[PDB]
Design a protein around this ligand. Structure first.
Ligand SMILES: Nc1ncnc2c1ncn2[C@@H]1O[C@H](CSCC[C@H](N)C(=O)O)[C@@H](O)[C@H]1O
Ligand SMILES: Nc1ncnc2c1ncn2[C@@H]1O[C@H](CSCC[C@H](N)C(=O)O)[C@@H](O)[C@H]1O
Ligand SMILES: [Zn+2]
Lengths: 397, 92, 408, 18, 131, 104, 41
RNA sequence: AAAUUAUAUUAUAUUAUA
RNA sequence: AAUCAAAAUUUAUUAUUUAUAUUAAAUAUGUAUGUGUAGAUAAAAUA
């Protein structure tokens, strides 16, 4: 019900959040070039996994900024590396540069624009002042990003008392504009052959400094690498759905809330399928093997199972691992299942078949442990004030 | 059950009598500011009359509120509509 | 030199629009209020200032750098659902100048109503996005609009389409895709083919209609006979358990408790899919955040549980006050064919002391004895010293946060 | 009486187990 | 800042170098115990559960002479690593391991087995010859 | 009685000495308005805490360049992010769920 | 005059111990599970 | 709805914010 | 049953904490309740 969902989210939110950050940290380290444009979340009661994936793969488009000092915000993905490069460039400008010449150009430009707005004559007598102009419109777009970061809500520019732009109110020509930035390899032309002949030129560290220091190519690299376009969340219970919609709509826009997986729903294709703490919650009447096979059928990229560390849970996850690795020799080699983390051998798990685990329950569960800052409801319910809470999780990537 | 609806009704009746005392030759400031205060206390009075409907006090002042709203020359109003329905029930 | 014309479909040429529900009662509601009279008084204040400076007149009785000019008197209204755009056009036409409407919708087919509104006047008075009404606070923030109008249910455009579902008298097998936009999941054919018997009863009982004795009979009929390839087999099984459908179809002018079980099941299955319980509870409570001080909120309710939801929200929210409640006039039911039970809820926001007005009417002796116990035992306590609770404060900034805005 | 609250949430199959 | 951007590109190159050897590494399965030496349990990429020991000081395969200090080799041979690393993380296969014991394996999984069995039944069960 | 109602001039942790009822709220109403009013997060100082990439590269500049590859292998083999602190979006969702109902 | 029922249940939810309630309810669920397992054989 | 198992006593706590 | 210096173990540096004491403005409106940690132990009936 909704009360069960209230208590479940308030009790397990930080624990499931820490587990998802641990598994997504390992996924960002092991696969840096994986950007999941389409994400399906199976059993998404609360969108903790969707929120963690949004924080990992798109730290800049959140409503509230991340705690930049923490280790959890340094991921291996190219979008996360781009946002970390922006914050690192901010730190380099603030701390490792003692010169006030940047502030000198800043207040000179501010006073110059405030003086040319209504006082001075026009800017045509001063020749080749385009360097002020393009950095001024770039700083204006940075100011719009500053308003988005200040109000914790996009589309704030229509809220204020400025006049709206005449022409395109509905936003149709901004979405139907042919982009001149994406060029297919056959579409290039009218160039000298000596540029495409000599290969292996930008291997010097100075040319890498040129490629890092410029900010015009940053937006051009970020516009093609859209991190999360469509997110589909599956949840049958209505209370879990109506609380997860309260959770996700503040920072993850346009989430389609499916209610059930259909057997005809396996024809739609996703980049990342996350089943967090949901394989144990599948009832005994439902065939979990067909659900696991259907969840594998909807993966262009990565399928991530996350669950609590328990005996029944580890048996469920190891059976699911065996069922998916059964699908190896059935077709094309490029779509065969390979486990990235944790088990590197792809045989049966040696802890699952160890001698010591017959009479010892502790030597049975190949799991990992995440640490988090526990909330007040956990220290209210568990009688001990835990400054650091411990969540044991079993995972499968 | 206190009486702030009574204070709102007495303020509207005092404003109606102040516009009745605006029967001079021409005093545009009196008509202007009494119209402004009557509209402001009307918008403050709409919700209070909605809460205080079907009460022992509103039936005493319903005819005076209808007369004050008719003197201020505005009709096809929600308060005018509620007063018209309660007067039509009172006459039947 | 040829033109590539798109071949039309059946639903594009035979598309009908939604009739205007009420225009003169809406324009008094969604415009008029405290935010409107201070708007009209400020426009007259700028009129006597223009003749003071020396502008050309007539004989008559009385942020940052590139955004230097901000707009004048303009009255910003948010439309949660424009539909055919008649209620969105009633604000801008009758309001004349200094008014604005931002419209949202779930369906992309409401762009047709948004396109015709721009062709009359556009660029600076109309603005359209495609999103739910619950995601309005996430994309506009607090204290964003002078007024917010909320409608609910289906327009007449979606009822007649064979692809958008909602067809009961067509005599043909169409898919029961009865949802308002792509932001939801499965349709009613894929819902009833997969939902369990217990899950359907708990969702039917949440809307008040089709109570537990009757909903357990309808769910016994659905789950026992569900290979459902078309809506013809669905409407056969629904009308076999209860009575047949009413003559008006979706719009029944009869009483709510005297409505048949087939109509109660179909108007609740429409409410189960598009989540009108969640979207109206969130859309009203987010609207009281996005309103300015003394702003107006207009909600249209065509169902009895919606009248419970608006009545339960205003009495509990510590800023909401019902200005008045007006029902539909009798002339709109004949010519347009609307529901007799359609009401208009005009809710206003209070700056302060919103509970002192409600304590005049509903303050019993039992609530006074409960109030003394909650102070003695301290059950009105919250949380401040926990981990997420220390980072949360009220809307007004503190002295330690103002020095953070200077550097950041 | 905390265990009797969830009896309205059990599916109709296992509601009549003993 | 040029120092930091150059070393950022160099850390990117070194991380791209270690990611090629990353699929050959071990998995720390059980938490390591540390009393001078660090002893842990590993899943190898061969399908085995081994128990490995790591020392702080250098002991080569042929002779003990080297060009490293103790701090150098304790950063080389993963002693600081496996001291600060808990279970679920990677351990390099190029680091030498001392006194590795391969755990015995049975055919049927030990997960969801009852511990209320008798002692000789668990004895026959764990030695892959059940009753 | 005294203390049965809440005067809006007097603070909620203190108790008013007035006995009147008019112009006052019940304590359930005060609890709902205190749960309603407390939606905001305090402004985070960006400049007070430097980024983790900045401190990581600062520690890598001070290392010997022959030992930098082993530090890279040390940083890569650590799959634990540490003590996971909740994001302010996650804290906002947590408190949004916590403010919608009475504490009892 | 005694207290009404709803404030009594809310006060019992407000002031009682959480850990003892949790342990008693979890061991009650365990005892019910052992009864169900003993019935299943 | 009784018998009382109940310990009970008083004080403190957090990046106010550095 | 085949080994070796964690905190066997000592000492120091921009730096990581929890504690140590320092440590202040602010009535324009609206306002801010924990689990625990502790010392010797000398009241008792809504289930
Ligand atoms: N057979 C099934 N198919 C789809 N969802 C299911 C399911 N069985 C259970 N679930 C849902 O899976 C959810 C698991 S609770 C886990 C919540 C979410 N994964 C998170 O990490 O925050 C439950 O709310 C339940 O409603
Ligand atoms: N919760 C919601 N949020 C935004 N739009 C919604 C919505 N629920 C329904 N709609 C849309 O609103 C339309 C009907 S509203 C019907 C009346 C119409 N708004 C008018 O003024 O004339 C439907 O087409 C539907 O797509
Ligand atoms: Zn393993």
């Amino acid at each position: 019900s909704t009360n069960d969902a209230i208590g479940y989210f308030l009790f397990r939110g930080a624990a499931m959040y820490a587990g998802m950050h641990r598994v997504f940290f390992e996924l960002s380290k092991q696969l840096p070039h994986f950007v999941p444009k389409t994400m399906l979340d199976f059993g998404a009661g609360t969108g903790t996994a969707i929120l963690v994936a949004k924080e990992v793969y798109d730290p800049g488009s959140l409503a509230y900024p991340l705690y930049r000092s923490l280790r959890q915000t340094m991921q291996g993905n190219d979008s996360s590396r781009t946002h970390q490069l922006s914050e690192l460039r901010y730190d380099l400008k603030r701390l490792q540069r003692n010169n006030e010449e940047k502030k000198k150009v800043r207040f000179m430009a501010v006073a110059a624009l405030l003086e040319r707005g209504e006082v001075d004559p026009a800017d045509l007598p001063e020749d080749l002042k385009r360097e002020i102009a393009e950095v001024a419109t770039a700083a204006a777009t940075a100011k719009k990003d500053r308003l988005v970061r200040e109000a914790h809500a996009r589309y704030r520019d229509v809220v204020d008392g400025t006049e709206w732009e005449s022409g395109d109110p509905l936003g149709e020509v901004r979405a139907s504009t042919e982009d001149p930035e994406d060029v297919i390899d056959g579409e290039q032309g009218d160039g000298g052959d000596d540029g495409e002949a000599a290969k292996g030129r930008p291997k010097t560290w100075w040319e890498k400094l040129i490629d890092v220091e410029n900010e015009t190519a940053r937006t051009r690299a970020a516009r093609r690498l859209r991190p999360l376009q469509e997110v589909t969340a599956v949840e049958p219970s209505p209370g879990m759905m109506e609380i997860g919609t309260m959770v996700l709509h503040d920072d993850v826009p346009n989430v389609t809330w499916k209610r059930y997986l259909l057997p005809e729903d396996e024809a739609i294709q996703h980049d990342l399928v996350v089943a967090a703490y949901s394989l144990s919650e599948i009832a005994t009447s439902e065939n979990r093997r067909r659900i696991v096979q259907q969840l594998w059928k909807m993966t262009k990229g990565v399928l991530v199972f996350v669950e609590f560390a328990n005996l029944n849970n580890f048996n469920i996850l190891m059976e699911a691992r065996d069922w998916i690795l059964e699908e190896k020799d059935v077709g094309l080699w490029d779509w065969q299942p390979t486990i990235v983390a944790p088990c590197p051998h792809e045989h049966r798990c040696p802890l699952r078949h160890c001698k010591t685990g017959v009479k010892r329950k502790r030597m049975r569960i190949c799991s990992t442990e995440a640490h988090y800052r526990s909330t007040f409801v956990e220290v209210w319910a568990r009688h001990m004030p835990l400054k650091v809470g411990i969540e044991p999780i079993s995972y499968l990537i | 059950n206190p009486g702030p609806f009574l204070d709102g009704a007495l303020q509207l009746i005092k404003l109606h009598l102040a516009h009745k005392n605006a029967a001079a030759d021409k005093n545009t400031k009196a008509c202007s500011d009494i119209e402004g205060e009557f509209l402001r206390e009307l918008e403050a009075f709409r919700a209070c009359f909605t809460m205080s409907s079907s009460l022992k006090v509103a039936k005493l002042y319903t005819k005076k509120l209808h007369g004050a709203l008719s003197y201020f020359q505005l009709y096809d109003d929600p308060l005018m509509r509620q007063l018209d329905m309660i007067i039509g029930k009172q006459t039947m | 030199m040829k033109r590539i014309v798109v071949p039309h479909r059946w639903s594009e040429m035979n598309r009908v629009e939604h009739p205007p529900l009420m225009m003169k009662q809406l324009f008094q509601g969604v415009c008029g209020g405290l935010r409107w009279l201070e708007t009209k008084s400020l426009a007259q204040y700028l009129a006597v200032r223009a003749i003071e400076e020396g502008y050309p007149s007539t004989p008559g009785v009385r942020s940052l750098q590139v955004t230097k000019q901000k707009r004048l008197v303009s009255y910003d209204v948010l439309d949660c659902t424009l539909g055919s755009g008649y209620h969105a056009g009633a604000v801008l036409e009758n309001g004349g100048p200094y008014t604005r409407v931002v419209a949202l919708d779930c369906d992309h087919d409401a762009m047709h109503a948004a396109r015709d509104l721009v062709e009359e006047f556009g660029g600076d008075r109309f603005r359209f996005y495609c999103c739910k009404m619950s995601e309005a606070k996430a994309m506009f923030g607090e204290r964003s609009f002078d007024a917010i109008m909320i409608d609910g249910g289906v327009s007449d455009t979606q009822l007649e389409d064979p692809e958008r579902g909602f067809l009961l008298d067509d005599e043909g097998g169409h898919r029961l895709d009865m949802r308002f936009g792509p932001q939801m999941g499965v349709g009613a054919l894929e819902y009833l083919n997969t939902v369990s018997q217990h899950t359907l009863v708990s969702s039917l009982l949440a809307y008040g209609l089709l109570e537990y004795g009757q909903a357990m009979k309808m769910s016994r009929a659905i789950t026992r006979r569900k290979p459902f390839v078309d809506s013809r087999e669905v409407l056969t099984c629904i009308e076999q358990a209860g009575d047949e459908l009413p003559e008006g179809g979706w719009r029944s002018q009869g009483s709510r408790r005297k409505s048949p079980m087939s109509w109660k099941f179909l108007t609740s299955l429409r409410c189960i899919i598009n989540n009108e319980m969640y979207e109206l509870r969130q859309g009203i409570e987010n609207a009281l955040l996005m309103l300015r001080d003394d702003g107006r909120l207009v909600v249209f309710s065509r169902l009895p549980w919606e009248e419970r939801l608006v009545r339960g929200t205003v009495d509990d929210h510590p800023h909401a006050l019902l200005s008045y409640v007006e029902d539909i006039s009798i002339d709109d039911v004949q010519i347009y064919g609307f529901t007799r039970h359609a009401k208009m809820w005009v809710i206003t926001r209070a700056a302060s002391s919103a509970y002192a007005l409600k304590n005049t009417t509903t303050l019993t002796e039992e609530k006074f004895r409960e109030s003394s116990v909650r102070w003695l035992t301290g059950m009105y306590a919250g949380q401040t010293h926990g981990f997420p609770a220390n980072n949360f404060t009220f809307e007004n900034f503190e002295r330690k946060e103002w020095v953070t805005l200077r550097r950041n | 009486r905390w265990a009797a609250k969830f009896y309205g949430q059990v599916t109709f199959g296992p509601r009549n187990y003993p | 800042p040029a120092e930091m951007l150059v070393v950022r590109q160099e850390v990117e190159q070194l991380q791209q170098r270690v990611m090629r050897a990353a699929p050959k590494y071990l998995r720390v399965v059980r938490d390591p115990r540390c009393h001078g030496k660090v002893q842990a349990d590993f899943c190898t990429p061969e399908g085995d559960l081994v128990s490995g020991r790591v020392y702080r000081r250098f002991y080569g395969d042929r002779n003990r002479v080297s060009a490293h200090s103790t701090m150098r080799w304790q950063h080389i041979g993963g002693w600081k690593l496996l001291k600060r690393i808990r279970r679920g993380s990677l351990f390099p296969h190029n680091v030498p391991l001392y006194a590795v014991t391969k755990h015995a394996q049975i055919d049927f999984p030990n997960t969801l087995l009852d511990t209320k069995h008798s002692t000789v039944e668990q004895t026959a069960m764990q030695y892959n010859d059940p009753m | 009685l005294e203390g049965a109602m809440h005067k809006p001039g007097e603070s909620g942790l203190q108790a008013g000495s007035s006995t009147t009822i008019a112009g006052k709220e019940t304590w359930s109403q005060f609890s709902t308005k205190m749960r309603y009013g407390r939606r905001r997060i305090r402004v985070i100082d960006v400049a007070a805490k430097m980024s983790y990439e900045y401190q990581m590269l600062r520690k890598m500049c001070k290392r010997r360049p022959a030992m930098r590859q082993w530090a890279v292998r040390d940083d890569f083999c650590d799959m634990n992010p540490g003590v996971v602190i909740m994001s302010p979006s996650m804290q906002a969702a947590f408190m949004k769920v916590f403010r919608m109902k009475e504490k009892g | 005059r005694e207290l009404p029922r709803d404030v009594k249940q809310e006060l019992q939810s407000f002031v009682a111990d959480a850990a003892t309630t949790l342990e008693s309810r979890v061991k009650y669920l365990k005892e019910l599970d052992t009864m169900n397992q003993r019935m299943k054989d």
